[PDB]
Write a protein that binds this ligand. Structure first.
Ligand SMILES: Nc1nc2c(ncn2[C@@H]2O[C@H](COP(=O)(O)OP(=O)(O)O)[C@@H](O)[C@H]2O)c(=O)[nH]1
Ligand SMILES: [Mg+2]
Ligand SMILES: [Mg+2]
Ligand SMILES: [Mg+2]
Ligand SMILES: [Mg+2]
Ligand SMILES: [Mg+2]
Ligand SMILES: [Mg+2]
Ligand SMILES: [Mg+2]
Ligand SMILES: [Mg+2]
Ligand SMILES: [Mg+2]
Ligand SMILES: [Mg+2]
Ligand SMILES: [Mg+2]
Ligand SMILES: [Mg+2]
Ligand SMILES: [Mg+2]
Ligand SMILES: [Mg+2]
Ligand SMILES: [Mg+2]
Ligand SMILES: [Mg+2]
Ligand SMILES: [Mg+2]
Ligand SMILES: [Mg+2]
Ligand SMILES: [Mg+2]
Ligand SMILES: [Mg+2]
Ligand SMILES: [Mg+2]
Ligand SMILES: [Mg+2]
Ligand SMILES: [Mg+2]
Ligand SMILES: [Mg+2]
Ligand SMILES: [Mg+2]
Ligand SMILES: [Mg+2]
Ligand SMILES: [Mg+2]
Lengths: 703, 82, 85, 62, 205
RNA sequence: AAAUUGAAGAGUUUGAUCAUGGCUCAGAUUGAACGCUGGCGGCAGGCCUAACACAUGCAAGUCGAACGGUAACAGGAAGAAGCUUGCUUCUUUGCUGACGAGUGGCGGACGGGUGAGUAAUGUCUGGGAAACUGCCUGAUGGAGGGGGAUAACUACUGGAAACGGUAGCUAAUACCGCAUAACGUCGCAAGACCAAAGAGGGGGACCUUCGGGCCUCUUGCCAUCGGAUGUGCCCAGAUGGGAUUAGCUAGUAGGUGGGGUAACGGCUCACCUAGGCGACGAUCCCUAGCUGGUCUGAGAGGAUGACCAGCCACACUGGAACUGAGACACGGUCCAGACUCCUACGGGAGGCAGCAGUGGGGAAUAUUGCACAAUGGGCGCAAGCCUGAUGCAGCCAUGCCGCGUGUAUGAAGAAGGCCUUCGGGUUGUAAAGUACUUUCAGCGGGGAGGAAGGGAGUAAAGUUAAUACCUUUGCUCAUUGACGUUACCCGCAGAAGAAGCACCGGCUAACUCCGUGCCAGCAGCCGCGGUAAUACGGAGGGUGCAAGCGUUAAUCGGAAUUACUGGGC
């Protein structure tokens, strides 16, 4: 039945900063397990994981791709383990993707560069992994590059991220003469062979060049491993050397509770270290049943609603972590079965939305390539064709299973752009493309603001957002150029008050009626009410008929609602009716509303009121070294500031900035802060601003 | 094999077959050489469920016509001896 | 291909080789008879006709050609040889 | 072809896509088609309450 | 598929009595039967040939509780059947199961007969029928089911079933609560106010 | 008995009339779409345009009762694993059930799809001769005898794969010669010539080399004459528009001879004649699958070919053939073209107009579903396997039909709206209130029928030489439904969960007020709106239809408005 035992299943992710060697380390993994005949290089687009045309051309991973392998051992020590590795992206432009893959996986191998070590995206993946408490290990890649030092990278990890790291494999030699690595348990130096592409290696006697630091760190490894149970420490302090098996098990325990991360070193480009990192994935990373079960809520929660041991007998439960786009079926749902068994054709219940979905074609994955499989067992990552409504993060299960799983959080887009196709009448096709790309990606949203015709595109970055437009050009072909959003202004009176009026000679004999109103315009103040329309009834002279006395406020709405000046609504206008004229036969309301309109018009021209811009509450965090640069950038713009606050891990700056300015502020912020700042918009009250554009939007049309 | 088979006419969830002597290549409801009686499967009442045309069926089977399984069963049940 | 109609393809090619061999042998024997009839030596034409006749009857029986085709060959050749005198 | 825009008030700009049906307006010589209101971004006649199946106006609650 | 509204409006629009109410009180005492239902009912619009044909057809439609599609079907069937079209049409309208139920009591109105037929309380010739359009046939025995006998409406309807002309084609046995359908009513066996040729020529236009 | 019983008009040229004459409406119908609304069930329908391009999964396999054989499972056999001479399982033996791959047989030419081409090589109707036909069936016979291979396999080997090489083999219902065959072929005659294959079940002997021989029955093979079916071919009539298409044709029309076809034939070749078709429309151009039938019409007729069924044609475009009874072959071969895909760059694979499904086009047309349980089809002695045929399920008020959204009672004729002559009227028994019912929807419980068959045992005869083994007909046994939480029945709660769409000047059924003021707007036709609009917009009221309604598109009718029936100058 089940091909591989549940213990011999690894669902692992490869997460780190941009270009740390993650996509290569995956190629060398697929090479040392024989599934790909050619090694392939990321720069020459040969990489199988980089299947999208953008990924080939720009040498970046714009998506998560899944693959499988069978790593027996370095000497075939263990039975073949089925490792499901989903390569992930490091660009801040695509963070949903890394968190998306990160949630389901049981372990993470965090790549690092020897030159740089801890980098901004490395802290980002660290915080994402820490919130989901995934057990982690680390690989220091690019040890061949100059400036390489294992020790410094270890110290950077300890000092910055916060973990206390235990070295597992040190490095023999400098950057160019990187022969191989020495393990701190078997006490063997696995020097790799240059002639062949890393497939073979030769074990040596760990020469005296590094025989004292090696012993020291080996001892530190022993001591760190002994902090798993009192039985380890008691024998350790007894003067006897612990056996390798208990050391490895105690380390596996410490990784399981996430106290420590095990750091291995190697260089994928130099075809070295990859076999040892995969070996340490088998030895130390957790299998699905090597942790306690996942929890959930049933019928608005319970004491212990679900503790589903991953097994082939319990009822089916899963999570759809990823949605992809297939032009030929219309969807591609990636799911991890946490506990249960499902098969082709089987129906499931989407617990959150309470509906029925049929699994048409469950398949397994090798990057873009798809291989049909009849059934999926528990703990396996697969893709489900035939799903047409399930959003990212929705639990898919058979009936009487946990309704809601913990995967209920997604980030907020920072960059907002507009887009408009060259031929304007491709709007329906573009809208369909945007709707699909927004349903698949929850961090990309498309809302068409109804003041204008523009389609608003929100994303995590300018890269993100332009990959979402050239991808449209290539697949589901449409040609569209991006631009800037338009302006949503409002108006406030510049402290002017009078008793203006309006009058038209509607009588003429035959017509039979006329209307006149005496109003009193005033503002209240900038931002005391949500309901800008204020009206306190006070009609004294010429009191109108008593069936529609309070009904002379809704008729004023059709002027305040939209468009008195340059097609922009108005806020804070107060009307106060004192006098007028009528005749109590049939005083026509619709032609009495003309007097009020001309009264508003006259009040507007005599008032000389000025335009009000949208200004929001941005809040930014940053390290206490770039405070000057960020505040200088806001000061260069017409931006106010609010809060002298310093956090413990940074500083929270609060600033009031316009909306027509600061277009693409996030990317500039990342540039001037080394990509280590975020922000948010709270849409606070509008503020006055001297603007040469405020009158140019109405003098474009003249009078 | 010129066959004598049921032709499956009628309505949804209530079949009513036509015993037709038709060449075995043509479809079930397709071209036939002759129709020899009907057969109502769902009849469980006084009116006759089935009716055959015994002399023409005998002529055909003497001319080498193949008899289907259900048509053989209806020839059986129609005869009093079986 | 896709299905197991490739077996019929191999059987068809082998049968084409065999049928082409045997049909060519038949046709060369009949060309021999025609050359004899066009030479005018009635005795060689009669011997050639009596040599081709069992060949064509055997193949007509096997099904490589039809009984009508064999009978047409024998009838035409007998008519030719009889008017040859 | 030329085509009428029925109802009271429209929103037809220079590139808006619309559905065209048969008809005639008779007083306009050369207009033999009518714009189907309330279909394909040609919004329905505002504040309409009678003959509402035509002009593409959704049902008020009332 | 059923008019759930004010029946008396219908009656006074046709002017005559459509028998859409029980005999508890007279028709005039419940509605102003003389005038039309509108606020302009007091006035009188001069009739037209199409007007009177439509009004006769609608009077028949409102009496029997039939909709236009079914009534058109009953006219295609009546035209198909040999003999006088209007006579066949009246037979097909009296053949309706709610019609025969009403004419046999058990409901003070044809809408009550529709409720009785629909709520699985009727057995025609043994088989429990609950289809209000069931075309009754000669020698059919209409029986009420158990758990429906002695209910308030059936008792009120049986007592109220008197004071009206007994149909000469039904031969109902009141006490045991079974009735027969010995033969279809002929032309002269009905209201005689219904001008059937008007409807026939309206539907043959 | 009955197979019909069937034919309506109106508005609009005019100051008004009568004719002529056109436009429009009332009806029926749709593979429909759009707008508004939407409860259920049954039966049907569902890419009308791009025969545009297709990812993916299935749409054709089967037979061990043809054969060599053993890859996988099981049963055993010999044991010196495990061991208490084993219940706690080591390998080998096709030995037996079985069976991957292979040789071979049959199917793959059926079923399914589409209408591009085709105006006549097609179809329909009615005949005909110059024909073939696997499987089905009847009649007569034969069914001696032998050989060479060869796949599979073994070895070496090449290739990324696809797929091969090169030697050694090993069978067969694979192939080949001989013998033999005449109411069979050729020949006027005489005469000459042509075939095969065996396998399975059991068994009284009796002989063996436990291979079996031998006796039975069941199938299978070969020849010939028949029938049935299916197919090929020919003739006549009919089957669109254009003369703003009058000449067309050189194998062209025919004859003789040779060749070819299963078969007649310029089908083809070599000569010879100079014919042949055409004003009854040849030739050319555009369009088009044809028919039973569908819609309409009282008919005659007009339009049409969605469903269903028959025939034809096509399978990415063009051409040619092979195997085979049958093809010039959807899911076969070869080539040329274009497209797409895999590649290790050396090469290789494919053709959804099969069922789903995608892109695109379009106003517009469904699920990447469940079973072979029914009936069929292929294979097989069967059991059984396969079948995207078929039976079902899903989506969509797309159509037709049926039902429900309550029923009775109820005058303060409530409030409120609207009109008002200010009296009142209308909304209106309508509501509320009172009494009663629970169809259908929702829960809970019972529950047909579509199921015939097939398998094992048994008995009876038929069978032989044998009560065995095989047919056939009964008796018993366990049984086979995807649909399916089936139809249907019973119970539980309560009127709860269920009404909208168009119109209201005349045609045409149903009128007033308000706001607008030749404006905004309505309209199928006549027309309306420039200060009292039943014609616009809203409100009240009413009329028609109703889970639908209206609009648009299309056909016929009305249209006697192409008038043959049935018109005029
Ligand atoms: N020198 C060197 N270059 C490396 C190494 N690993 C990867 N690279 C290259 O560095 C670049 C970034 O590595 P890549 O795997 O694309 O990173 P990712 O995009 O974050 O997965 C590519 O051009 C790689 O070929 C390494 O160990 N040494
Ligand atoms: Mg990468
Ligand atoms: Mg209905
Ligand atoms: Mg195509
Ligand atoms: Mg086999
Ligand atoms: Mg041999
Ligand atoms: Mg043979
Ligand atoms: Mg000849
Ligand atoms: Mg012509
Ligand atoms: Mg065509
Ligand atoms: Mg007519
Ligand atoms: Mg079709
Ligand atoms: Mg051929
Ligand atoms: Mg195909
Ligand atoms: Mg084929
Ligand atoms: Mg489209
Ligand atoms: Mg079957
Ligand atoms: Mg199937
Ligand atoms: Mg009132
Ligand atoms: Mg129910
Ligand atoms: Mg049954
Ligand atoms: Mg039975
Ligand atoms: Mg009227
Ligand atoms: Mg109309
Ligand atoms: Mg007015
Ligand atoms: Mg109006
Ligand atoms: Mg006519
Ligand atoms: Mg005339």
């Amino acid at each position: 039945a089940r091909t591989t035992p549940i213990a011999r299943y690894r669902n692992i992710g490869i997460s780190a900063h941009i270009d740390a060697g993650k996509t290569t380390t995956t190629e060398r993994i697929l090479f040392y397990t024989g599934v790909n005949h050619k090694i392939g290089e990321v720069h020459d687009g040969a990489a199988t994981m980089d299947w999208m045309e953008q990924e080939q051309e720009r040498g970046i991973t714009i998506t998560s791709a899944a693959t499988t392998a069978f790593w027996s051992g370095m000497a075939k020590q263990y039975e073949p383990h089925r490792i499901n590795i989903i390569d992930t992206p490091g660009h801040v432009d695509f963070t949903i993707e890394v968190e998306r893959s990160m949630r389901v996986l049981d372990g993470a191998v965090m790549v690092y560069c020897a030159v740089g070590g801890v980098q901004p995206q490395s802290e980002t993946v660290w915080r994402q992994a820490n919130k989901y408490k995934v057990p982690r290990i680390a690989f220091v890649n690019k040890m061949d590059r100059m400036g390489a030092n294992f020790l410094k990278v270890v110290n950077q990890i300890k000092t910055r991220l916060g973990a206390n790291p235990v070295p597992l494999q040190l490095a023999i030699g400098a950057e160019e003469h990187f022969t191989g690595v020495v393990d701190l348990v078997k006490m063997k130096a696995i020097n790799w062979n240059d002639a062949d592409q890393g497939v073979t290696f030769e074990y040596e006697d760990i020469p005296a060049d590094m025989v004292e630091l090696a012993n020291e760190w080996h001892q530190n490894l022993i001591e760190s491993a002994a902090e798993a149970s009192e039985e380890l420490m008691e024998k350790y302090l007894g003067g006897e050397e612990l056996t390798e098996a208990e050391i490895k098990g105690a380390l596996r325990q410490r990784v399981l509770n996430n106290e420590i991360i095990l750091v291995t070193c190697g260089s994928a480009f130099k075809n070295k270290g990859v076999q040892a990192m995969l070996d340490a994935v088998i030895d130390y990373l957790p299998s699905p049943v090597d942790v306690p079960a996942i929890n959930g809520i049933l019928d608005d929660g319970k004491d212990t609603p679900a503790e589903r041991h991953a097994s082939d007998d319990e009822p089916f439960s899963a999570l759809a972590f990823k949605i992809a786009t297939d032009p030929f079926v219309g969807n591609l749902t990636f799911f991890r079965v946490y506990s249960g068994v499902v098969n082709s054709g089987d129906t499931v219940l989407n617990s959150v939305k309470a509906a029925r979905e049929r699994f048409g074609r469950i398949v397994q994955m090798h990057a873009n390539k798809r291989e049909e499989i009849k059934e999926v067992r528990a703990g396996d990552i697969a893709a489900a064709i035939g799903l047409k409504d399930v959003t990212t993060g929705d639990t898919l299960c058979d009936p009487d299973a946990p309704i809601i799983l913990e995967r209920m959080e997604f980030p907020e887009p920072v960059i907002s752009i507009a887009v408009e196709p060259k031929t304007k009448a491709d709007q329906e096709k573009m809208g369909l493309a945007l709707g699909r790309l927004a349903k698949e990606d929850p961090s990309f949203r498309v809302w068409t603001d109804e003041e204008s015709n523009q389609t608003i595109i929100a994303g995590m970055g300018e890269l993100h957002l332009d990959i979402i437009v050239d991808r449209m050009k290539r697949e589901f072909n449409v040609e569209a150029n991006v631009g800037k959003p338009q302006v949503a202004y409002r108006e406030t009176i510049r402290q002017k008050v009078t008793d203006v009026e309006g009058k038209h000679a509607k009588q003429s004999g035959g017509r039979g009626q006329y209307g006149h109103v005496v109003i009193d315009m005033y503002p209240l103040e900038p931002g005391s009410n949500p309901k800008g329309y204020e009206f306190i009834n006070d009609i004294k002279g010429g009191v109108i008929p008593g069936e529609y006395i309070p009904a002379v406020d809704k008729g004023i709405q059709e002027q305040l609602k939209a468009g008195p000046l340059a097609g922009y609504p108005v806020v804070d206008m107060g009307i106060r009716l004192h006098f007028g004229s009528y005749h109590d036969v049939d005083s026509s309301e619709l032609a009495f509303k003309l007097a009020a309109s001309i009264a508003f018009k006259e009040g507007f021209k005599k008032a000389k009121l000025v335009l009000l811009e949208p200004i929001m509450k941005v809040e930014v965090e940053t390290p206490e070294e770039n405070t000057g640069d960020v505040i200088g950038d806001l000061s260069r713009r017409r931006g106010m500031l609010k809060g002298q606050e310093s956090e413990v891990t940074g500083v929270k700056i609060h600033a009031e900035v316009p909306l027509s300015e600061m277009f693409g502020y996030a990317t500039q912020l990342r540039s001037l802060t080394k990509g280590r700042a975020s922000y948010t918009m709270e849409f606070l009250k509008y503020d006055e601003a001297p603007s040469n554009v405020a009158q140019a939007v109405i003098e474009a049309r003249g009078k | 094999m010129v066959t004598i088979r049921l032709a499956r006419h009628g309505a949804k969830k209530r079949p009513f077959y036509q015993v037709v002597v038709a060449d075995s290549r043509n479809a079930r409801n397709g071209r036939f050489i002759e129709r020899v009686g009907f057969f109502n499967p769902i009849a469980s009442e006084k009116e006759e469920g089935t009716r055959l045309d015994l002399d023409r069926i005998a002529h055909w089977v003497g001319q080498g016509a193949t008899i289907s399984d259900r048509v053989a069963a209806l020839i059986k049940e129609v005869n009093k001896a079986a | 291909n896709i299905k197991s109609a490739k077996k019929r393809a191999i059987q068809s090619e082998k049968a084409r080789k065999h049928n082409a061999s045997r049909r060519s042998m038949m046709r060369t024997f009949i060309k021999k008879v025609y050359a004899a009839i066009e030479a005018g030596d009635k005795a060689a034409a009669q011997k050639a006709f009596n040599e081709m006749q069992p060949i064509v009857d055997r193949q007509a029986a096997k099904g490589l050609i039809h009984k009508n085709k064999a009978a047409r060959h024998k009838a035409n050749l007998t008519a030719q040889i009889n008017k040859l005198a | 072809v030329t085509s009428y825009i029925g109802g009271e008030g429209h929103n037809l700009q220079e590139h808006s896509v619309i559905l065209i049906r048969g008809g005639r307006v008779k007083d306009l010589p050369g207009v033999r088609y009518h714009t189907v209101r309330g279909a394909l971004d040609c919004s329905g006649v505002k504040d309409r309450k009678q003959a509402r199946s035509k002009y593409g106006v959704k049902r008020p609650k009332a | 598929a059923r008019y759930l509204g004010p029946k008396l409006k219908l009656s006074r629009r046709e002017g005559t009595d459509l028998f859409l109410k029980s005999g508890v009180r007279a028709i005039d005492t419940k509605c102003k039967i003389e005038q039309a239902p509108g606020q302009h009912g007091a006035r009188k619009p001069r009739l037209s040939d199409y007007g009177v044909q439509l009004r006769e057809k609608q009077k028949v439609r409102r009496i029997y509780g039939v909709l236009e599609r079914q009534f058109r079907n009953y006219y295609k069937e009546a035209a198909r059947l040999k003999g006088n079209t209007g006579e066949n049409l009246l037979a097909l309208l009296e053949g309706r199961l709610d019609n025969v139920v009403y004419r046999m009591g058990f409901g003070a109105t044809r809408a009550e007969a529709r409720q009785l037929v629909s709520h699985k309380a009727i057995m025609v010739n043994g088989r429990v029928v609950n289809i209000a359009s069931y075309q009754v046939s000669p020698n059919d025995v209409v029986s009420i089911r158990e758990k429906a006998k002695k209910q308030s409406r059936v008792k009120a309807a049986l007592e109220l079933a008197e004071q009206r002309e007994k149909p000469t084609w039904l031969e109902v046995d009141a006490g045991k609560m079974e009735g027969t359908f010995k033969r279809k009513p002929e032309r002269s066996d009905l209201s005689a106010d219904i001008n059937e040729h008007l409807i026939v020529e309206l539907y043959s236009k």
